[PDB]
């Protein structure tokens, strides 16, 4: 099988039913002691809690799940009727994240979308129903963040005080959509330095917040 799939075993041999905090935690444990994977971690995990709680979005977009340690971070968090969208383009991934929330029980509150942002970004208002997002957590291929914040931009999707929020602005780094929304009139930015993933690496999240057009 697959990392995936083991530290998905491993969280179902483990942790418990209907506690997000106890899924996070076997995560954590699982991929310090056993394999390293790129799940935002619990540093970054930290600072994102803080955002959330400062912001209260009522809707949610995540663009590349994974397994889906983030959602459940920022899912638990969320005020009760508030949603998240995530979307994920590798179909084993998209599965795992899903039964991931299933096991938190958080599923009532997250839409776990298979597919690339790409394709799917353009139909958030017409299927989904969306107006515009509050909040955007991008954590997928890097040199995607640029292309998918403009393409955002383009559908109409944003609004003013539209958080974004982007991880691995350090390692691996994302150097177009950093210089891009730290030189935007549109975007006002704020860099929280941390460390990789489980590791003593430095790292950091960037928040952008869009101001118009
Ligand atoms: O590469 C990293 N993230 C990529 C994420 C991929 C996930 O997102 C999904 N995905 C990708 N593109 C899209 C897409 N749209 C675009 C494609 O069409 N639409 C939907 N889903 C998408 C993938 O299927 C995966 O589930 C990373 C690396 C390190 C790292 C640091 C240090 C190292 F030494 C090694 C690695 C640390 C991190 O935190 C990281 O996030
Ligand atoms: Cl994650
Ligand atoms: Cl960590
Ligand atoms: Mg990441």
Same mark, same amino acid.
């Given at each position: 099988?697959?990392?995936?799939?083991?530290?998905?075993?491993?969280?179902?041999?483990?942790?418990?039913?209907?506690?997000?905090?106890?899924?996070?935690?076997?995560?954590?444990?699982?991929?310090?002691?056993?394999?390293?994977?790129?799940?935002?971690?619990?540093?970054?995990?930290?600072?994102?809690?803080?955002?959330?709680?400062?912001? =209260?979005?009522?809707?949610?977009?995540?663009?590349?799940?994974?397994?889906? *340690?983030?959602?459940?971070?920022?899912?638990?968090?969320?005020?009760?009727?508030?949603?998240?969208?995530?979307?994920?383009?590798?179909?084993? *991934?998209?599965?795992?994240?899903?039964?991931?929330? !299933?096991?938190?029980?958080?599923?009532?509150?997250?839409?776990?979308? !298979?597919?690339? =942002?790409?394709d799917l970004i353009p139909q958030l208002?017409?299927? *989904?129903?969306?107006?515009?997002?509050?909040?955007?957590?991008?954590?997928?291929?890097?040199?995607?963040?640029?292309?998918?914040?403009?393409?955002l931009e383009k559908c109409g999707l944003?609004?003013?005080?539209?958080?974004?929020?982007?991880? !691995?602005?350090?390692?691996?780094?994302?150097?177009?959509?950093?210089?891009?929304?730290?030189? =935007? =009139?549109?975007?006002?930015?704020?860099?929280?330095?941390? *460390?990789?993933?489980?590791?003593?690496?430095?790292?950091?999240?960037?928040?952008?917040?869009?101001?118009?057009?």
């Amino acid at each position: 099988d697959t990392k995936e799939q083991r530290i998905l075993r491993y969280v179902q041999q483990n942790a418990k039913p209907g506690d997000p905090q106890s899924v996070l935690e076997a995560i954590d444990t699982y991929c310090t002691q056993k394999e390293w994977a790129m799940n935002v971690g619990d540093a970054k995990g930290q600072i994102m809690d803080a955002v959330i709680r400062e912001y =209260s979005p009522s809707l949610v977009l995540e663009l590349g799940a994974y397994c889906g *340690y983030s959602a459940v971070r920022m899912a638990r968090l969320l005020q009760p009727g508030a949603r998240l969208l995530t979307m994920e383009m590798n179909p084993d *991934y998209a599965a795992i994240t899903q039964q991931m929330l !299933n096991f938190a029980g958080l599923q009532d509150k997250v839409t776990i979308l !298979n597919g690339a =942002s790409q394709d799917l970004i353009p139909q958030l208002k017409k299927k *989904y129903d969306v107006d515009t997002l509050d909040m955007v957590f991008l954590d997928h291929w890097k040199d995607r963040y640029l292309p998918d914040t403009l393409l955002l931009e383009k559908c109409g999707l944003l609004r003013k005080g539209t958080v974004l929020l982007a991880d !691995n602005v350090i390692v691996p780094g994302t150097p177009d959509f950093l210089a891009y929304v730290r030189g =935007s =009139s549109s975007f006002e930015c704020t860099h929280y330095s941390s *460390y990789l993933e489980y590791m003593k690496v430095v790292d950091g999240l960037e928040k952008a917040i869009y101001q118009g057009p």
